[PDB]
Amino acid sequence: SPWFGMDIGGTLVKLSYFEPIDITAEEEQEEVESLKSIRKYLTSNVAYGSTGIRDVHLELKDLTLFGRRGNLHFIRFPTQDLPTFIQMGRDTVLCATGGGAYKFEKDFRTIGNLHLHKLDELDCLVKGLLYIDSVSFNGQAECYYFANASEPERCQKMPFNLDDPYPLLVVNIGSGVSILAVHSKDNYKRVTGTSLGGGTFLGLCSLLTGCESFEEALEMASKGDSTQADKLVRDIYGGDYERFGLPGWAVASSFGNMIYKEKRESVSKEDLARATLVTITNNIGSVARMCAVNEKINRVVFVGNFLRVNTLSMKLLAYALDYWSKGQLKALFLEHEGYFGAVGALLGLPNF
Amino acid sequence: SPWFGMDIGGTLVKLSYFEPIDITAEEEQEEVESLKSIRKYLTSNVAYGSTGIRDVHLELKDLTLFGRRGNLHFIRFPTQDLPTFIQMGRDTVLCATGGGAYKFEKDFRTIGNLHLHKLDELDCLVKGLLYIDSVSFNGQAECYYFANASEPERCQKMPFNLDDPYPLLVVNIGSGVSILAVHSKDNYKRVTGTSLGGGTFLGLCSLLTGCESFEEALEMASKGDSTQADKLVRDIYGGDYERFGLPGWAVASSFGNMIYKEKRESVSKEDLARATLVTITNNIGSVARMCAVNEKINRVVFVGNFLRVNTLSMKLLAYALDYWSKGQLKALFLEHEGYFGAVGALLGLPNF
Ligand SMILES: Nc1ncnc2c1ncn2[C@@H]1O[C@H](COP(=O)(O)OP(=O)(O)NP(=O)(O)O)[C@@H](O)[C@H]1O
Ligand SMILES: Nc1ncnc2c1ncn2[C@@H]1O[C@H](COP(=O)(O)OP(=O)(O)NP(=O)(O)O)[C@@H](O)[C@H]1O
Ligand SMILES: Nc1ncnc2c1ncn2[C@@H]1O[C@H](COP(=O)(O)OP(=O)(O)NP(=O)(O)O)[C@@H](O)[C@H]1O
Ligand SMILES: Nc1ncnc2c1ncn2[C@@H]1O[C@H](COP(=O)(O)OP(=O)(O)NP(=O)(O)O)[C@@H](O)[C@H]1O
Ligand SMILES: C[C@@H](CO)c1ccc(CC(=O)N2CCN(c3ccc(C#N)nn3)CC2)cc1
Ligand SMILES: C[C@@H](CO)c1ccc(CC(=O)N2CCN(c3ccc(C#N)nn3)CC2)cc1
Ligand SMILES: [Mg+2]
Ligand SMILES: [Mg+2]
Ligand SMILES: [Mg+2]
Ligand SMILES: [Mg+2]
């Protein structure tokens, strides 16, 4: 049967699909038409229906997996459209993770003889992240950081080696945020989480601006000035708060200048989108910083789809984590964004 | 001259005023008319102008201070109205703290011969909190907690003894949030802060609901259901996330159900006010919890005017801190709310 792993999150479904490329002459004969149809559909289209997308740039080419060679594909669609997916499937051993592996278990079982194996969303995240870094991104580093993140004229993406990845703090920014302390391949802990995550960005942005997609919210934020909404240290002190080393540009109160009616009447949607992005991103960085200090871990890797096509938040995390930790913590990022749980689920197939 | 301490914050000015009650016969004669006018104005009115308020219920009666007996009064007004206050003063040694002691230093000096002494906002907070607990609230405890905070039929305010108050984590929830680790009367550190504070509650509430006061925002929140806006663990899993002990009712994504247009169209202003309150309150509790764990401190006292007339947030902090710490941390509260910096500033008078 086809080799899939699926991570059904609170907002997005992520699917990893292994396309064999070593199909012999006899194997092609023995391939049933429904299976050939699935493989050709997945590999000849980059858009599936109105809301599924194959992230072609992430494809791992000529990967050896379970003793076969193939291409590993990365596909996403909204969890809201899982009914379309399941209806397509009804018209296979599925390793599935995320909350939706449990929430929609009975729905997957409407597919006759389908064998669903539910796997833990954070176990799959850790296994998938370690796996992808181990095999490399087609010979390039999977992990990167922003060098000189405090100096815009210098700041640039650069590769980072994770060959000995432990210990590692993993900050998974999805709908909500989970924070993991990883001590070895089989020893990690969920330190805590925060509810101020990607769904808070998208939900608050939607309420405040009328945006109707994540991409629109980011486009608005790129044009906005968060300081039109936020109350800064310099708005309270007139300058720095010197005694505790707080710069005047630091945010004292997110959205705190919106207590003034005349400021609410002048602020733009773009300013509000950027203030929402800045508020959520700084809170994630600060929680990660406190967790790293307590866990005695100095490498913090941020993953999850809050950061897909979101260089603004990545650079803010890189700058803020470095600044507020006095250079003791380093922000790291991974090219495969939000797909690690789906890969980790796929990697569970040999156990069944 | 009159004995005042003033804390000029990012949103509110707090004023502590000592009314002498041991005025002799000769002292009354030597009292100049402008001074008698100030004392009678302050003690015969509970509303000053359109926006100043004396919190009569907080008055400390027959306090011995600087060798005299008197009543200690607690007065607040918006920082936006400090121009009215200074104009009243122009038509004295002022110990002043908060950011506004610096921001408005030149304005205070428009009052002829006035001597301004700027004091640190967190030093004054610590000194004032320790002082008020030491003298008691007219014989009652200044500090309280909520007993049995997880059981609504039992939950009740009860006094707490701080006679040996160290160590103590102090969470100051003003416009922004400062977190202090207090080891002795003269040894404390500002552990960190968060920008998601009282100004975020009021500013976001105002944007989302059109409320035009803090009190209106709380009234709205009391009628709302935050789960109409928030995405809960049970919305993602269908139930608890058992592996990591996350109950289905926990918030996975604040405002995370507002990514759906039809839910934005059905949610009420009251629901949005309550979701704003819950989001900000849980984040403050969680940051306090992480700081307490790292500082090895098990008593966390929450102060600042985000919590004035705000039993909803106090009870949520008491429940959440107890729940998420597995009973290892206790939330404490103080009757004098947001006045500690103003008292601490007053206590600096003998140094000048
Ligand atoms: N399964 C895989 N498929 C494709 N490329 C891989 C895979 N695993 C690792 N790689 C990449 O290819 C490189 C060589 O891997 P590999 O052929 O396993 O040699 P090796 O690991 O150095 N020695 P060994 O594992 O003992 O045979 C690695 O450094 C990765 O960059
Ligand atoms: N096309 C998109 N649609 C919706 N959200 C997007 C999209 N692209 C990026 N995002 C962001 O990515 C977040 C979801 O990230 P993701 O890691 O896929 O979470 P999830 O697994 O669905 N949720 P969770 O159950 O909390 O693990 C959203 O909250 C958005 O901030
Ligand atoms: N300055 C004060 N003015 C009014 N009441 C006070 C003051 N200081 C403390 N109190 C309260 O009054 C009680 C008695 O205080 P006090 O008269 O100082 O006796 P004491 O502290 O027990 N002994 P001592 O300080 O050595 O003279 C305290 O426990 C407080 O509740
Ligand atoms: N009447 C009120 N007007 C405005 N805000 C109020 C009022 N009553 C309570 N609040 C809340 O109290 C918060 C301000 O608390 P407060 O401790 O006085 O901060 P501040 O000292 O002015 N600010 P900061 O400079 O950050 O210390 C506001 O953000 C509101 O959430
Ligand atoms: C799995 C993923 C799905 O989306 C996810 C679930 C839940 C959460 C939230 C989370 O993990 N939480 C723990 C820490 N929480 C608090 C709250 C108050 C106090 C105090 N006082 N302490 N901790 C909030 C929720 C994220 C991601
Ligand atoms: C004095 C008072 C006035 O209102 C006040 C000032 C400032 C603040 C905010 C504060 O103290 N901050 C420190 C911690 N911050 C971050 C941000 C990102 C990362 C990472 N990565 N780490 N830390 C945010 C601001 C509160 C109160
Ligand atoms: Mg997820
Ligand atoms: Mg090898
Ligand atoms: Mg203050
Ligand atoms: Mg005594």
PDB file of C-alpha atoms in Angstrom, chain A residues 14-118:
ATOM      1  CA  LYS A  14       0.251  17.649   7.170  1.00  0.00           C
ATOM      2  CA  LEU A  15       0.873  14.610   5.008  1.00  0.00           C
ATOM      3  CA  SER A  16       4.236  13.014   4.162  1.00  0.00           C
ATOM      4  CA  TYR A  17       4.161  10.682   1.177  1.00  0.00           C
ATOM      5  CA  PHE A  18       6.987   8.397   0.018  1.00  0.00           C
ATOM      6  CA  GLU A  19       6.991   7.987  -3.776  1.00  0.00           C
ATOM      7  CA  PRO A  20       9.010   4.876  -4.722  1.00  0.00           C
ATOM      8  CA  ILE A  21      11.362   5.483  -7.641  1.00  0.00           C
ATOM      9  CA  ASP A  22      12.848   1.981  -7.847  1.00  0.00           C
ATOM     10  CA  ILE A  23       9.708   0.278  -9.198  1.00  0.00           C
ATOM     11  CA  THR A  24      10.822  -2.785 -11.141  1.00  0.00           C
ATOM     12  CA  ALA A  25       9.181  -4.157 -14.270  1.00  0.00           C
ATOM     13  CA  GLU A  26       7.302  -6.877 -12.364  1.00  0.00           C
ATOM     14  CA  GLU A  27       6.188  -4.491  -9.614  1.00  0.00           C
ATOM     15  CA  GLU A  28       4.557  -2.147 -12.123  1.00  0.00           C
ATOM     16  CA  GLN A  29       2.493  -5.064 -13.467  1.00  0.00           C
ATOM     17  CA  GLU A  30       1.347  -6.123  -9.964  1.00  0.00           C
ATOM     18  CA  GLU A  31       0.338  -2.509  -9.175  1.00  0.00           C
ATOM     19  CA  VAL A  32      -3.441  -2.137  -9.034  1.00  0.00           C
ATOM     20  CA  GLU A  33      -5.095   0.718 -10.908  1.00  0.00           C
ATOM     21  CA  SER A  34      -6.326   2.576  -7.816  1.00  0.00           C
ATOM     22  CA  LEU A  35      -2.754   2.649  -6.517  1.00  0.00           C
ATOM     23  CA  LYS A  36      -1.290   3.869  -9.812  1.00  0.00           C
ATOM     24  CA  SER A  37      -4.028   6.514  -9.844  1.00  0.00           C
ATOM     25  CA  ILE A  38      -3.059   7.817  -6.386  1.00  0.00           C
ATOM     26  CA  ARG A  39       0.641   7.993  -7.230  1.00  0.00           C
ATOM     27  CA  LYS A  40       0.079   9.794 -10.532  1.00  0.00           C
ATOM     28  CA  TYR A  41      -2.465  12.186  -8.971  1.00  0.00           C
ATOM     29  CA  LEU A  42      -0.095  13.142  -6.140  1.00  0.00           C
ATOM     30  CA  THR A  43       3.027  13.497  -8.324  1.00  0.00           C
ATOM     31  CA  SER A  44       1.416  15.240 -11.346  1.00  0.00           C
ATOM     32  CA  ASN A  45      -0.364  17.981  -9.351  1.00  0.00           C
ATOM     33  CA  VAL A  46       0.919  20.589  -6.913  1.00  0.00           C
ATOM     34  CA  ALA A  47      -2.565  21.832  -5.989  1.00  0.00           C
ATOM     35  CA  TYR A  48      -5.153  19.290  -4.831  1.00  0.00           C
ATOM     36  CA  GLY A  49      -8.704  20.473  -4.999  1.00  0.00           C
ATOM     37  CA  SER A  50      -9.179  24.022  -3.837  1.00  0.00           C
ATOM     38  CA  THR A  51      -7.173  23.849  -0.615  1.00  0.00           C
ATOM     39  CA  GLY A  52      -4.460  21.143  -0.749  1.00  0.00           C
ATOM     40  CA  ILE A  53      -0.868  22.162  -1.578  1.00  0.00           C
ATOM     41  CA  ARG A  54       2.300  20.163  -2.251  1.00  0.00           C
ATOM     42  CA  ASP A  55       5.360  22.071  -1.007  1.00  0.00           C
ATOM     43  CA  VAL A  56       7.550  20.986  -3.920  1.00  0.00           C
ATOM     44  CA  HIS A  57      10.609  22.932  -2.710  1.00  0.00           C
ATOM     45  CA  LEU A  58      10.774  20.711   0.400  1.00  0.00           C
ATOM     46  CA  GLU A  59      10.863  17.414  -1.502  1.00  0.00           C
ATOM     47  CA  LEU A  60      13.601  15.027  -0.411  1.00  0.00           C
ATOM     48  CA  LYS A  61      14.858  13.347  -3.559  1.00  0.00           C
ATOM     49  CA  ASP A  62      16.279   9.821  -3.784  1.00  0.00           C
ATOM     50  CA  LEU A  63      15.837   9.062  -0.093  1.00  0.00           C
ATOM     51  CA  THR A  64      16.419   5.496   1.085  1.00  0.00           C
ATOM     52  CA  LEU A  65      13.539   4.555   3.393  1.00  0.00           C
ATOM     53  CA  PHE A  66      12.557   1.084   4.614  1.00  0.00           C
ATOM     54  CA  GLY A  67      15.072  -0.381   2.179  1.00  0.00           C
ATOM     55  CA  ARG A  68      13.587   1.292  -0.919  1.00  0.00           C
ATOM     56  CA  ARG A  69      14.582   4.432  -2.780  1.00  0.00           C
ATOM     57  CA  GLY A  70      12.053   7.164  -3.378  1.00  0.00           C
ATOM     58  CA  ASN A  71      11.100  10.812  -3.078  1.00  0.00           C
ATOM     59  CA  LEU A  72       9.581  12.163   0.134  1.00  0.00           C
ATOM     60  CA  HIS A  73       6.769  14.656  -0.555  1.00  0.00           C
ATOM     61  CA  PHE A  74       5.236  17.207   1.817  1.00  0.00           C
ATOM     62  CA  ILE A  75       1.538  18.107   1.480  1.00  0.00           C
ATOM     63  CA  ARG A  76      -0.774  20.270   3.584  1.00  0.00           C
ATOM     64  CA  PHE A  77      -4.469  21.193   3.700  1.00  0.00           C
ATOM     65  CA  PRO A  78      -6.820  22.668   6.298  1.00  0.00           C
ATOM     66  CA  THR A  79      -8.186  20.345   8.969  1.00  0.00           C
ATOM     67  CA  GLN A  80     -11.587  21.885   8.131  1.00  0.00           C
ATOM     68  CA  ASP A  81     -11.340  20.042   4.781  1.00  0.00           C
ATOM     69  CA  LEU A  82     -10.554  16.605   6.222  1.00  0.00           C
ATOM     70  CA  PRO A  83     -14.146  15.564   5.259  1.00  0.00           C
ATOM     71  CA  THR A  84     -13.246  16.067   1.583  1.00  0.00           C
ATOM     72  CA  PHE A  85     -10.073  14.028   2.102  1.00  0.00           C
ATOM     73  CA  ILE A  86     -11.921  11.155   3.753  1.00  0.00           C
ATOM     74  CA  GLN A  87     -14.628  11.212   1.071  1.00  0.00           C
ATOM     75  CA  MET A  88     -11.884  11.001  -1.576  1.00  0.00           C
ATOM     76  CA  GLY A  89     -10.403   8.028   0.280  1.00  0.00           C
ATOM     77  CA  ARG A  90     -13.731   6.178   0.375  1.00  0.00           C
ATOM     78  CA  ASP A  91     -14.384   6.735  -3.338  1.00  0.00           C
ATOM     79  CA  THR A  92      -3.822   0.889   3.621  1.00  0.00           C
ATOM     80  CA  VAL A  93      -2.134   1.326   6.997  1.00  0.00           C
ATOM     81  CA  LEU A  94      -2.382   4.938   8.160  1.00  0.00           C
ATOM     82  CA  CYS A  95      -0.018   6.091  10.852  1.00  0.00           C
ATOM     83  CA  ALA A  96      -1.608   9.264  12.168  1.00  0.00           C
ATOM     84  CA  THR A  97      -0.699  11.777  14.830  1.00  0.00           C
ATOM     85  CA  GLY A  98      -1.895  15.123  16.152  1.00  0.00           C
ATOM     86  CA  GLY A  99      -5.087  15.636  18.084  1.00  0.00           C
ATOM     87  CA  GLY A 100      -7.119  14.771  15.021  1.00  0.00           C
ATOM     88  CA  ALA A 101      -5.835  11.182  15.021  1.00  0.00           C
ATOM     89  CA  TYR A 102      -8.039  10.800  18.086  1.00  0.00           C
ATOM     90  CA  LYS A 103     -10.811  13.293  17.270  1.00  0.00           C
ATOM     91  CA  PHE A 104     -11.431  11.827  13.808  1.00  0.00           C
ATOM     92  CA  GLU A 105     -10.559   8.204  14.542  1.00  0.00           C
ATOM     93  CA  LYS A 106     -14.117   7.048  13.827  1.00  0.00           C
ATOM     94  CA  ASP A 107     -14.122   8.995  10.564  1.00  0.00           C
ATOM     95  CA  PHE A 108     -10.966   7.314   9.282  1.00  0.00           C
ATOM     96  CA  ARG A 109     -12.559   3.973  10.056  1.00  0.00           C
ATOM     97  CA  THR A 110     -15.328   4.691   7.526  1.00  0.00           C
ATOM     98  CA  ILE A 111     -12.698   3.736   4.938  1.00  0.00           C
ATOM     99  CA  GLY A 112     -13.169  -0.019   4.622  1.00  0.00           C
ATOM    100  CA  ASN A 113     -10.463  -2.267   6.074  1.00  0.00           C
ATOM    101  CA  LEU A 114      -8.321   0.844   6.726  1.00  0.00           C
ATOM    102  CA  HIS A 115      -5.949   0.302   9.650  1.00  0.00           C
ATOM    103  CA  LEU A 116      -5.435   3.450  11.740  1.00  0.00           C
ATOM    104  CA  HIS A 117      -2.503   3.591  14.172  1.00  0.00           C
ATOM    105  CA  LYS A 118      -2.584   6.616  16.465  1.00  0.00           C
TER     106      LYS A 118
END
